Design a binder for this molecule. Structure first.
Ligand SMILES: *[C@@H]1O[C@H](CO)[C@@H](O[C@@H]2O[C@H](CO)[C@@H](O)[C@H](O)[C@H]2NC(C)=O)[C@H](O)[C@H]1NC(C)=O
Lengths: 107, 107, 47
């Protein structure tokens, strides 16, 4: 399971992400994880390999977005080392924005 | 478990920007907790792909090997639809299954 | 100045505006009341 600090980011900003590594019993396991970050058309731009052993199943990591970037939907994909065919994924967006000051609900 | 996050203070509603406040965290003994505090205006822009506990149990239910809410065509169909194998010394045993996924309903 | 307003020099501007923060890790090792550990974290707010 992959948690990101935001669901959408700016060019030139930092993405903070924690990967929780559990077994089938949802209990923390210590294994080596292969994580990849892919572009909108599916090009891996940054990849990692790390074991969560003795870290209580938590992999806190970081990466900086360059300003030279194609805006759109970006995907993080991850899989264990001993199970490469079981691929997990979650998505986020890159755009040029400032935050609004109010919310609109359509009911 | 049961992780709850609440306010330590009981008064001074809507605190001032920069003010110190007490974050109270009740939870299971021995647990490690991770935190992130986000402006809601990020979520008004994009609230997709937010992780929650209900989606975790939804992922586990999608990984279930049982395909039917009980019963079966016979004793062998009861175990096979539940997700179990049986084999006896007399000869009675479950049906062969070579597919990981569940058979699709006609719909 | 003598007028009924805050002078400009001691007006202190808000400037800490990041959207996401408090990227912290803590372990529940406080005394378990009914098995529940009560952790108190006094934290600074932002601007
Ligand atoms: C330049 O970069 C853009 C992204 O900014 C890419 O073109 C995109 O391609 C996707 C399909 O994979 C479309 O959905 C987008 O609408 C395209 N963006 C556009 C047209 O601005 C591609 O890498 C390059 N495209 C061009 C036309 O130079």
């Amino acid at each position: 399971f992959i948690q990101t600090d935001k669901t959408i980011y700016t060019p030139g900003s930092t993405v903070l992400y924690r990967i929780f590594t559990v077994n089938h019993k949802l209990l923390p396991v210590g294994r080596t994880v292969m994580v990849n970050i892919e572009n909108p058309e599916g090009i891996p731009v940054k990849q990692d390999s790390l074991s969560s052993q003795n870290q209580l199943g938590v992999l806190p990591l970081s990466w900086d977005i360059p300003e030279l970037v194609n805006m759109g939907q970006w995907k993080i994909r991850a899989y264990y080392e001993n199970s490469p065919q079981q691929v997990f994924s979650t998505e986020f967006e890159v755009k040029e924005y400032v935050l609004p000051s109010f919310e609109v609900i359509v009911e | 478990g049961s992780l709850v996050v609440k306010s330590g203070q009981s008064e001074d509603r809507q605190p001032v920007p920069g003010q110190q406040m007490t974050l109270k965290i009740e939870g299971d003994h021995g647990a490690r907790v991770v935190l992130v505090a986000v402006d809601k205006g990020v979520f008004v822009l994009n609230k997709k792909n937010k992780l929650t506990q209900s989606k975790i149990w939804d992922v586990v239910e999608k990984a279930d090997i049982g395909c039917t809410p009980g019963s079966g065509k016979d004793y062998a169909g009861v175990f096979s639809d539940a997700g179990l194998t049986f084999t006896s010394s007399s000869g009675q045993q479950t049906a062969q299954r070579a597919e990981l996924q569940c058979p699709q309903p006609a719909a | 100045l003598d007028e009924d307003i805050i002078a400009e020099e001691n007006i202190v501007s808000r400037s800490e505006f990041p959207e996401s923060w408090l990227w912290n890790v803590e372990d529940l090792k406080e005394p378990p009341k009914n098995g529940i550990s009560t952790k108190l974290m006094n934290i600074f707010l932002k601007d």
